[PDB]
Amino acid sequence: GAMGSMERASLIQKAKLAEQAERYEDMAAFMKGAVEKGEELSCEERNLLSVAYKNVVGGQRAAWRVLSSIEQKSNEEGSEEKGPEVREYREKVETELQGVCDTVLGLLDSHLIKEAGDAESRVFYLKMKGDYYRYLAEVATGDDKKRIIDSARSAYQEAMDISKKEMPPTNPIRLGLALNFSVFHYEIANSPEEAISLAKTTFDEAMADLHTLSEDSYKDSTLIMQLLRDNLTLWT
């Protein structure tokens, strides 16, 4: 790897600089290099890894959606033929997106998840695994679509089982996991009722635990709770 010669601490320092500069591709390459040093990641480092790749794939997902919409319009009745270019370029963006998802899933499999024993790290990584299979599912169309969806579901479910046993209902990782599993149900698995039920139960159980929290933890938890509420308002 091109980062093999750089110190772990230098990679982390540069990842933070890249974040400040909004250079998320650089940030992701630095954090990939840090992961490949083979040591477990701290909480802050796990968050840097996620921020970097979420922003990279986020740009690709937004582009893919624009191109897919153009492609779908080109396939309506009355639309003039324009040749293979729209499909080709959508496929180019899609392949690059898939490559990023595969890179992240590779890092989680070699060897972040197997070395993660504490609930906060293990749930974070399993959530990430569900998320990047979900992003793969958003563009999947062929024989592997069902297996991609089930890989996302399985990762989220393992994370949910751990989070319910080991974390308080207000924990931001537990909340963000439930939020994203609910989005998976609604947008990927054609299960809007499950999505709504999960969002509601998650929100209500967090509400009843807010009284235990400091001012700062309250702000962290309520920020994610508002996203659950926003989704429920959209879906109901």
Binding site: K54, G176, L179, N180, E187, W235
Partner: peptide, 9 residues
Amino acid sequence: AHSSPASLQ
């Protein structure tokens, strides 16, 4: 729909 922020405490 909104998904989670990347950074979670």
